[PDB]
Design an enzyme around this catalytic site. Structure first.
Site, PDB file in Angstrom:
ATOM      1  N   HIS A 109      30.154  54.857   3.274  1.00  0.00           N
ATOM      2  CA  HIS A 109      31.146  54.098   3.036  1.00  0.00           C
ATOM      3  C   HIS A 109      30.966  53.050   2.462  1.00  0.00           C
ATOM      4  O   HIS A 109      32.427  52.897   2.069  1.00  0.00           O
ATOM      5  CB  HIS A 109      31.393  54.270   4.547  1.00  0.00           C
ATOM      6  CG  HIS A 109      31.573  55.673   5.343  1.00  0.00           C
ATOM      7  ND1 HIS A 109      32.559  56.102   4.761  1.00  0.00           N
ATOM      8  CD2 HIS A 109      31.770  55.883   6.423  1.00  0.00           C
ATOM      9  CE1 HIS A 109      32.318  57.077   6.245  1.00  0.00           C
ATOM     10  NE2 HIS A 109      31.362  56.772   7.096  1.00  0.00           N
TER      11      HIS A 109
ATOM     12  N   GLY B 175      32.807  51.616   7.648  1.00  0.00           N
ATOM     13  CA  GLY B 175      32.241  52.182   8.144  1.00  0.00           C
ATOM     14  C   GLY B 175      31.246  52.101   9.303  1.00  0.00           C
ATOM     15  O   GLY B 175      30.270  53.295   8.612  1.00  0.00           O
TER      16      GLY B 175
ATOM     17  N   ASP C 230      27.597  64.896   6.372  1.00  0.00           N
ATOM     18  CA  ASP C 230      27.428  64.112   7.711  1.00  0.00           C
ATOM     19  C   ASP C 230      29.713  64.449   7.929  1.00  0.00           C
ATOM     20  O   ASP C 230      29.681  65.154   6.954  1.00  0.00           O
ATOM     21  CB  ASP C 230      27.753  62.849   7.588  1.00  0.00           C
ATOM     22  CG  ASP C 230      28.049  61.556   8.476  1.00  0.00           C
ATOM     23  OD1 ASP C 230      26.828  61.021   8.352  1.00  0.00           O
ATOM     24  OD2 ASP C 230      29.057  61.396   8.292  1.00  0.00           O
TER      25      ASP C 230
ATOM     26  N   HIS D 145      31.372  62.528   8.380  1.00  0.00           N
ATOM     27  CA  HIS D 145      33.016  61.944   7.767  1.00  0.00           C
ATOM     28  C   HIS D 145      32.601  61.779   6.209  1.00  0.00           C
ATOM     29  O   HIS D 145      31.505  62.725   5.327  1.00  0.00           O
ATOM     30  CB  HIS D 145      32.424  60.500   7.914  1.00  0.00           C
ATOM     31  CG  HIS D 145      32.365  60.193   9.834  1.00  0.00           C
ATOM     32  ND1 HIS D 145      31.643  59.762  10.374  1.00  0.00           N
ATOM     33  CD2 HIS D 145      33.526  59.897  10.296  1.00  0.00           C
ATOM     34  CE1 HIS D 145      32.078  59.334  11.786  1.00  0.00           C
ATOM     35  NE2 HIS D 145      32.828  60.011  11.605  1.00  0.00           N
TER      36      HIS D 145
ATOM     37  N   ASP E 265      26.216  63.715  12.867  1.00  0.00           N
ATOM     38  CA  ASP E 265      26.794  63.747  13.734  1.00  0.00           C
ATOM     39  C   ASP E 265      27.689  65.027  13.868  1.00  0.00           C
ATOM     40  O   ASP E 265      29.073  64.671  14.657  1.00  0.00           O
ATOM     41  CB  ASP E 265      28.020  62.403  13.606  1.00  0.00           C
ATOM     42  CG  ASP E 265      28.135  61.670  12.121  1.00  0.00           C
ATOM     43  OD1 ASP E 265      27.824  62.652  11.217  1.00  0.00           O
ATOM     44  OD2 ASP E 265      28.492  60.935  11.434  1.00  0.00           O
TER      45      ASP E 265
ATOM     46  N   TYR F 297      25.345  60.026  16.573  1.00  0.00           N
ATOM     47  CA  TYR F 297      24.998  58.947  17.808  1.00  0.00           C
ATOM     48  C   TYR F 297      23.843  59.079  19.262  1.00  0.00           C
ATOM     49  O   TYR F 297      24.235  58.510  20.110  1.00  0.00           O
ATOM     50  CB  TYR F 297      26.479  57.919  18.152  1.00  0.00           C
ATOM     51  CG  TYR F 297      26.861  57.334  16.681  1.00  0.00           C
ATOM     52  CD1 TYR F 297      27.863  59.283  15.856  1.00  0.00           C
ATOM     53  CD2 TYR F 297      26.416  56.786  16.447  1.00  0.00           C
ATOM     54  CE1 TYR F 297      28.350  58.245  14.350  1.00  0.00           C
ATOM     55  CE2 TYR F 297      26.708  55.820  14.673  1.00  0.00           C
ATOM     56  CZ  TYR F 297      27.782  57.155  13.978  1.00  0.00           C
ATOM     57  OH  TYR F 297      27.774  56.784  13.010  1.00  0.00           O
TER      58      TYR F 297
HETATM   59  C1  LIG Z   1      40.973  50.172  20.570  1.00  0.00           C
HETATM   60  N1  LIG Z   1      42.019  52.133  19.286  1.00  0.00           N
HETATM   61  C2  LIG Z   1      42.206  52.425  20.302  1.00  0.00           C
HETATM   62  C3  LIG Z   1      40.519  52.301  18.264  1.00  0.00           C
HETATM   63  C4  LIG Z   1      39.688  51.328  17.920  1.00  0.00           C
HETATM   64  C5  LIG Z   1      38.437  52.124  17.267  1.00  0.00           C
HETATM   65  C6  LIG Z   1      38.286  53.858  15.999  1.00  0.00           C
HETATM   66  C7  LIG Z   1      37.985  54.532  15.382  1.00  0.00           C
HETATM   67  O1  LIG Z   1      37.946  54.086  14.006  1.00  0.00           O
HETATM   68  N2  LIG Z   1      36.676  55.210  15.602  1.00  0.00           N
HETATM   69  C8  LIG Z   1      35.375  55.585  14.457  1.00  0.00           C
HETATM   70  C9  LIG Z   1      34.502  54.401  13.605  1.00  0.00           C
HETATM   71  C10 LIG Z   1      34.230  55.134  12.366  1.00  0.00           C
HETATM   72  C11 LIG Z   1      33.233  55.857  12.237  1.00  0.00           C
HETATM   73  C12 LIG Z   1      32.462  56.783  11.107  1.00  0.00           C
HETATM   74  C13 LIG Z   1      30.755  56.092  10.944  1.00  0.00           C
HETATM   75  C14 LIG Z   1      30.020  57.502  10.415  1.00  0.00           C
HETATM   76  O2  LIG Z   1      29.559  57.799  10.990  1.00  0.00           O
HETATM   77  N3  LIG Z   1      29.975  58.208   9.557  1.00  0.00           N
HETATM   78  O3  LIG Z   1      29.412  58.852   8.953  1.00  0.00           O
HETATM   79  C15 LIG Z   1      39.554  54.619  17.019  1.00  0.00           C
HETATM   80  C16 LIG Z   1      40.465  53.742  17.796  1.00  0.00           C
HETATM   81 CO   LIG Z   2      29.033  59.990  10.190  1.00  0.00          CO
HETATM   82  K   LIG Z   3      30.519  64.486   4.654  1.00  0.00           K
END
Ligand SMILES: CN(C)c1ccc(C(=O)NCCCCCCC(=O)NO)cc1
Ligand SMILES: [Co+2]
Ligand SMILES: [K+]
Ligand SMILES: [K+]
Length: 356
Positions: A121, A129, A156, A158, A245, A284
């Site tokens: 990312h 990210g 991934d 994502h 993931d 994770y």
């Molecule tokens: C307080 N609230 C309602 C929230 C807070 C954070 C998230 C979020 O973005 N979560 C996802 C995190 C992104 C991870 C992507 C990294 C990854 O594994 N890339 O491959 C959503 C809602």
């Molecule tokens: Co990911």
């Molecule tokens: K991907």
């Protein structure tokens, strides 16, 4: 010769620090060790990435910032908070990926592994990210010294946005990402109509997938796309991102895959017999990610592994059942096979514009 496995006691301890995946690096390696696979690979100490090496992609302003905040406003917010030592962990993982790229150049091996890489990312001047540095971009750029056309495949959960963006205007590097694509779902980009821009138009590929995809339909998708990319683009090397993931039991709670479905994807790529650089990424459910990347490591090595988890440092993490196999959850498959077919056609269409 034999696959390179990037590793050292200190690199692992370093990656162990990463606050979102504590001790994952030790878990993965410990499990690979318990199955004796390090015996069947060449172990290579990663080099730490220098400031100039990281500036092959990242800006000086970003990098110096990263360093300063590492001692005590470039995307270093909620998802990438500015904690102590982050500059060093970033250099470590960056150098580890570059080092693997170097091994592939010097024909030392045809496959090189950095399980703790895959930070897809990060942007040239911004963290994103959980990614403070784009090691996949750093390694691709290193491979370009030798290899004319690089294929970056990203499996991934994502969208590999950081890597796509870095190469979005070029025809020398093609990016293929399969990912969850849903309103609200990070990072929000990579619909099938995303194809890159300018001289790079048609040299980005994106497969948007909904919740609950399982091994069979997933491999059908992946094979169908890679076959076309291979014929059209005719890559001279492959950087491959294998974030776990996607695997059933992950708290991302999205895809319903098992490591057998992914390794079949990895096998497809491996038979092309190109210089391949293997990266980890998300994942994770820590024991599950270890099982995955251990199994995938089996695949790289054409080994079949025993179903029972050997005893080792983290054996308790594998209870109650202590088996290598992961059982699909009972979650619904949300992917209508019509939508999948249009997606595949749209990409096949696109790839006709790619003529070398
Ligand atoms: C307080 N609230 C309602 C929230 C807070 C954070 C998230 C979020 O973005 N979560 C996802 C995190 C992104 C991870 C992507 C990294 C990854 O594994 N890339 O491959 C959503 C809602
Ligand atoms: Co990911
Ligand atoms: K991907
Ligand atoms: K591109």
């Amino acid at each position: 010769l034999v696959p390179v496995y990037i590793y050292s006691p200190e690199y692992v301890s370093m990656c162990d620090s990463l606050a979102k995946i504590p001790k994952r690096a030790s878990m993965v390696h410990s499990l690979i060790e318990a199955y004796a696979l390090h015996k069947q690979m060449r172990i290579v100490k990663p080099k730490v990435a220098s400031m100039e090496e990281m500036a092959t992609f990242h800006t000086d302003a970003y990098l110096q910032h990263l360093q300063k905040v590492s001692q005590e406003e470039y995307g270093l917010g909620y998802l990438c908070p500015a904690t102590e030592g982050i500059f060093d962990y970033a250099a470590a993982i960056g150098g580890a990926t570059i080092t693997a790229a170097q091994c592939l150049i010097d024909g030392m091996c045809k496959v090189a592994i950095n399980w703790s890489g895959g930070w897809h990312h990060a942007k040239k001047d911004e963290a994103s990210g959980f990614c403070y540095l784009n090691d996949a971009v750093l390694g691709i750029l290193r491979l370009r010294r030798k290899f004319e056309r690089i294929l970056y495949v990203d499996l991934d959960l994502h969208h590999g946005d950081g890597v796509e963006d870095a190469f979005s205007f070029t025809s020398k590097v093609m990016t293929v990402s399969l990912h969850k694509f849903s309103p609200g779902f990070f990072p929000g980009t990579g619909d099938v109509s995303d194809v890159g821009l300018g001289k790079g138009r048609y040299y980005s590929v994106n497969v948007p997938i909904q919740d609950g995809i399982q091994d069979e339909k997933y491999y059908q998708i992946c094979e169908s796309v890679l076959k076309e990319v291979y014929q059209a683009f005719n890559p001279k090397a492959v950087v491959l991102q294998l974030g776990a993931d996607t695997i059933a039991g992950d708290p991302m709670c999205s895809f319903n895959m098992t490591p057998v479905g992914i390794g079949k994807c990895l096998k497809y790529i491996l038979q092309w017999q190109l210089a391949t650089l293997i990266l980890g990424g998300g994942g994770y459910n820590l024991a599950n990610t270890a099982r995955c990347w251990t199994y995938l490591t089996g695949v790289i090595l054409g080994k079949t592994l025993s179903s029972e988890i050997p005893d080792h440092e983290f054996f308790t993490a594998y209870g109650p059942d202590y088996v290598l196999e992961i059982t699909p959850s009972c979650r619904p498959d949300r992917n209508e096979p019509h939508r999948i077919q249009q997606i595949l056609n749209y990409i096949k269409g696109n790839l006709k514009h790619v003529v070398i």
